[model samples]
Target: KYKLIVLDLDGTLTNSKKEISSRNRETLIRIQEQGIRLVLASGRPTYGIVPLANELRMNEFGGFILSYNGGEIINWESKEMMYENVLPNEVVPVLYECARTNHLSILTYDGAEIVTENSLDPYVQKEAFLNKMAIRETNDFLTDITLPVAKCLIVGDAGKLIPVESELCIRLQGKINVFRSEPYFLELVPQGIDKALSLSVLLENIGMTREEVIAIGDGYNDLSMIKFAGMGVAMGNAQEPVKKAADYITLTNDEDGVAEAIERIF
Candidate 1:
């Protein structure tokens, strides 16, 4: 029997509007009762996963979280870290300079807080609503910024964000992990960080092996976890590339793909 199930949030667990289905939520709680641990693995920061964790009564269910694309891992009940990867404090000024020159909206997280230089953007607002996160805006990005972040995000028009992503990766090669979730969203986490590696770290820390793990996702960033897990499930609406990486494909997110996968596994 699988001992763990790791899931991606935005498209996999939630509908297009980013709300979790009541069906999936109840199914997950039931699965945990069967002695399976549920792990939320996402590029979203820890604060983004906490509300959902609480809603599911995850602390009582022996839940864990892999956030910021592997930069932070937390034990739900004790609220302790298994691992944390922060951007070097020095990179802050450089990132700020680049964002200014390129006209990019840069957002940073110090694990517990999100720091943005301006008002909340659409994505940030939606994330806040879905994850129940508090946003702290500031006029001075440098003064408000904090170190030891889970990750940094760059959001803008696709035309602008994509090139900035390319340039940033080229400039900070081997110093960070750069990837795009959507055309307009560029994410930067710690070097060598990815969902697969993060899952591996979580497994090792929990004394579980890959053979006892299953992962479900529906996006480009989900590729690593899909390919690494013993059984990787892709949602029917997943991108072709993402589907190719998964070991199995389930119904679309709207059809309660996660719960369906769990039932089939049982």
Candidate 2:
């Protein structure tokens, strides 16, 4: 029997408007109440995800939030940090330079709100709106970021960021992980971290095996876990690449695909 349901919030669990439907929410809470473990995995920061987690009463039911795309994992019941993959401070300058050189906006999470050189950026504004958090512009992006961060995001035109992504990867090869969540957004995660690896860590810690898991998502970032889980599900509206990566396909988020997958599989 499956013991865990790992989910991607933005495009899988929540609808296109970025809200979790009542159908999905009720189904999720019902499943959790039945003793199934939930892990809300996403590229979103923990602060951004807390309200939804609270809505589902995950703290009472027990679950984990894999925030920052596997850069940090926190157990909801205990508020204990299960794992972390922090970027080396030295690499910040490289990303900082890459952002400026490419004429893009760079930002990182401060736990409570977002900090960035270009908080006014449309892409950045969308990110703020999705997270339901405040945006504070940083006068000096490099110096103002005094705390350690799991990832740094460079937001700009898709065409303009393509070469910069390749260049940064080639330059920072073994130092960090680089990928795009969307065409216009370049993400910088710490080296050797992703949804699959983090879930592996979580499962191993809880004494469960991958074959007893079911993972679902609808984005490029979700591909790793989708491929790793015993039953990987892609939303009907998932990206083309994500669909090919999944073991099965389900209805779109708006259609309550998560609830369908739960009843059908569990």
Candidate 3:
């Protein structure tokens, strides 16, 4: 039996409506009762993951969460940061310069709130809605931003973001880690930080191994952890590359995929 279960939140645990189904929630509770650990891993901030963690009683059960696409790891019960990696203070200004020159909208966080210059952008509004965080407009993000940013998010049309992603990857290759959480969302984190690396740290701390864990995800950012787990699972609605990387493919999120995975495994 697997000792740990790691899940990606948006498109893996929740369906299109972004709500966890009753079946999924009930199945998770049963798994938790069996002494299996549940981790809600996401590209969202810690604040965004807390509600679901509480819903699963993870805070009471010694579970954990990996947030910012592995930039931060928190012990659910103790609320202690097991690990955290943030963009260097010097790099933040460079990123802001890049975004401004390219006419791309950028965002960073001040705790749970989203800090951005273009709060009126539809994609920015969507991000605020999705994370359930308030948006704060700033005249100068470089000056307003606090040091050691959790991560930086670039929001734009998918078509427009494609070229920008490629350019940023080339421009900031050695300085940061860049990937797409979604086609329209380009994420930048500290170099050498990915879900697999963070998960490895968590496993070692808990005296477990990658072989004792099962990871489930549907997005490109989830690729590393999916590859690192003993049995990687991909959602039915997952991208082609992600499905190819998974050891097993479960039903679609709308069809209660997470519940299916739990039932089959346990």
Candidate 4:
């Protein structure tokens, strides 16, 4: 029996429309009631994930918000900060320059809002919409952001950002972990911070082993946790690489894939 279920928010837990279906929500609540720990892991900030967590009654169930692609973890009910990580101050300028050179928009969270130079950037707009975050658009973005953010997202055209992603990762090397969580969003977190690493740390703190965890997701960023999980579940809508890494495949998020996995397994 699994003690924990770590989920990827976007394409794995939420439908293409970006809402948890009635079916998925109901099943998750039932599982939560059974005392199974639930974690909502995503590249999104804690603010973006709050409404969804509340909808699932995470506070009552003691679910966790593993946000910023595992750079931070917090309990829903008590708001107890379980873990946190931040990009080095030096890397902030490096990430800023990379986005500037590529003419992309870079964003970071400041509590309730998303801070960005170009709120008009299509990808930035999409992120804002998806998270229901207000855009704190600014021309002086560097000065606007205080030092040491949990993570930063560089957004632009999917194909154009590919080379940016490759070069930035090469440039940052040991300084920061850089990769694309989606086609258009290059996620930059502190070195070695990802879902698996954060989850591993959490389990150790809670005195649980990896064998009691069930991780599910569809993105490349979700790969680490899926592989680290006792039962790594890939969504049917998951990219090929994720499916290849998963121990089992479930239905698409649109079809309540999370529900399918829970009902079948636990």
> Which candidate should be chosen as best, given lDDT against the real structure?
4
Pick the winner on lDDT between candidates 2 and 3.
2
Off by over 4 Å in 3: 158-167
Angstrom error at residue 192, model 1:
0.6
Q: What RMSD, rounded to one decimal, does every model reach?
A: 2.1, 2.0, 2.1, 2.1
Q: State residue 212's C-alpha deviation in candidate 4, in Å.
A: 1.4
Query: lDDT at 233 for candidate 2?
Result: 95
| Model 3: per-residue Cα lDDT over 208-247, one tens digit each | 9898999999988889899999989999999999999999
Return the TM-score for candidate 4, rounded to 2 decimals.
0.90
lDDT against the true structure, per candidate, is 0.81, 0.88, 0.87, 0.89
Q: Write the per-residue lDDT of candidate 2 for residues 65-125, one digit (tens) a residue.
A: 9988777889998999989898898999889998898788998888778899887899998
Q: Is candidate 3 or candidate 4 better by lDDT?
A: 4
Candidate 2 C-alpha error for residue 41, in Å? 1.0
Residue by residue across 157-255, what tens digits does model 4's lDDT show?
Answer: 889889988998889888887777678888888886768989988899888999899999998878889999999999999999999999999999998
Task: Show pairs that collide, candidate 3.
Answer: none
Q: In order, how many clashes per candidate?
A: 0, 0, 0, 0
- Tens-digit lDDT string for candidate 1 (158-221): 8888778888888888677688776766777668677788788888888998979999999888
Please report, as a residue range, the 10-residue window in candidate 1 with the lowest summed lDDT.
Answer: 123-132
> How far off is residue 63 in model 1, in Å?
0.7
TM-score-wise, the better of 1 and 2 is: 2
Ranking by TM-score: 2, 1, 3, 4
